Amino acid sequence: ATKAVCVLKGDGPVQGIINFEQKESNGPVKVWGSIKGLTEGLHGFHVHEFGDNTAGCTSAGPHFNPLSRKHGGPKDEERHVGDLGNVTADKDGVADVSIEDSVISLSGDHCIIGRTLVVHEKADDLGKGGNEESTKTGNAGSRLACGVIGIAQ
Amino acid sequence: ATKAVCVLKGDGPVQGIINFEQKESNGPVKVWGSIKGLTEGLHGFHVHEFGDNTAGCTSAGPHFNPLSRKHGGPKDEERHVGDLGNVTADKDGVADVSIEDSVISLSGDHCIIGRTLVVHEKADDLGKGGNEESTKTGNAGSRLACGVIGIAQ
């Protein structure tokens, strides 16, 4: 109900721990932790629809988008619920993740508990990449690491 | 007809996939799948409280026991919510799993979405093992594999 955690793993060296915390049922979720094993630069950071890892990260399915809008960035009006933008890996990289968000929730309808958090191959282009798949997914590439979002102590 | 799914993994060689389905919001949860990597015979099979995999299966914490009951078998009135009994490995180390259960839920106070399913080292003795531990954990021993229970297609 108020604190959640995701452990990120996949086929290569990308791994990390992401914590979620919601002080109040209608306020923002704080999101923090870190990821290592990343190429330097920007990586897409999304909640996808299914907490399903039967066949790797791909079974998590598409972006979590229960309001059925177009893909944008976290500060856009038009975005998926799961559009948490990009995280920035440093040169050792290492992304230190520190985010607040008012669309995702740990309770109710937009609830992300039991869904999959994914860190992608390249930058999320945020709807502004000028082709079809940019408006659907932001061309962030392949799924380097994922993890089902679970109830934390 | 809301569905969930769990992929089990641990430090050893046990692996499998478990599905849950609760076709109507009040009544039973079907649970089926398969698990390999086991020793012949009986293994404790439980829902633990936290969907927290940050230190492996240890971080899932204790049995999910929102009503503070004593450990028992899935057929008892006196049982943890998480008490699903034992699954059974044949001689090749394979468990076919076809429980149906009416204490766990995919909604409400007994919701197990985003918590952790664990398969144990030893048989669960169902609280009839005659020591203090039989009645806290069933003496099922080590956590061989676990995963977070997530939302499925």
Of the candidates B1, B22, B46, the residue with the CA atom closest to the CA atom of residue B105: B22
Of the candidates B91, B68, B95, the residue with the CA atom closest to the CA atom of residue B81: B68
Strand order of the sheet with strand B150-151? B143-148, B116-120, B41-48, B83-89, B95-101, B29-36, B15-21, B3-8, B150-151
Specify whether A43 is catalytic.
no
- Upper half-sphere CA count for residue B52 (Cβ side, 13 Å): 20
Tell me the C-alpha distance between B43 and A114, whole Å: 25
Residue B151: list chain A partners with CB under 8 A: 49-52, 114-115
Of the candidates A19, A149, A16, the residue with the CA atom closest to the CA atom of residue A94: A16
CB B85 within 8 A of CB B126: yes
Identity of residue B117: L
CB contact under 8 Å between A148 and B148, yes or no, is: yes
What is the third-level CATH fold of A1-153? Immunoglobulin-like (2.60.40)
CB A99 within 8 A of CB A124: no
CB pairs under 8 A between A and B: 83
Nearest to A7 among B54, B61, B149 (CB): B54
Q: Which residues of B are catalytic, by number? A: 46, 48, 63, 71, 80, 83, 120, 143
Residue A26's alpha-carbon distances to A94, A106, A152, B102, B108, in angstroms, are: 31, 10, 19, 32, 19
Give the three-state DSSP class for B152.
coil
Specify whether A63 is catalytic.
yes
Tell me the C-alpha distance between A79 and A64, whole Å: 10
Can you tell me which residue has the tokens 């996939």?
Answer: B17
Residue A147: list chain B partners with CB under 8 A: 53, 148
Tell me the C-alpha distance between A15 and A37, whole Å: 7
Q: Peptide bond preceding A94: is omega within 30 degrees of 0, i.e. cis?
A: yes
Q: Catalytic one among A43, A63, A79, A115? A: A63
Tell me the C-alpha distance between B112 and B117, whole Å: 9
CB contact under 8 Å between A54 and B7, yes or no, is: yes
- Upper half-sphere CA count for residue B55 (Cβ side, 13 Å): 6
Nearest to A7 among B53, B152, B153 (CB): B53
Mutate to test the interface with A, among B59, B109, B113 (most CBs of A within 10 A): B113
Tell me the C-alpha distance between B53 and B61, whole Å: 10
Encode burial over B75-113: b for 16+ CB neighbours within 10 A, e otherwise. ebeebbbbbbbbbbbeeeeebebebebebbbbeeebbbb
What is chain B's alpha carbon radius of gyration, rounded to the nearest angstrom?
Answer: 14
Give the three-state DSSP class for A11.
coil
Can you tell me which residue has the tokens 């409400």?
Answer: B108
B43 appears as a binding residue in the annotation: no
Specify whether A110 is catalytic.
no
CB contact under 8 Å between A51 and B5, yes or no, is: yes
Tell me the C-alpha distance between B115 and B37, whole Å: 23
Binding-site residue numbers of A for Cu cation are 46, 48, 63, 120
A33: left (phi over 0), alpha (psi -120 to 50) or beta: left
Tell me the C-alpha distance between A27 and B118, whole Å: 33
What are the beta bridge partners of residue A145? A119
What are the beta bridge partners of residue A5? A19, A150
Tell me the C-alpha distance between A56 and A142, whole Å: 12
Burial class (CB within 10 angstroms; exposed 0-12, middle 13-18, buried 19+) of B130: exposed
Of the candidates B3, B121, B47, the residue with the CA atom closest to the CA atom of residue A51: B3
B37: left (phi over 0), alpha (psi -120 to 50) or beta: left
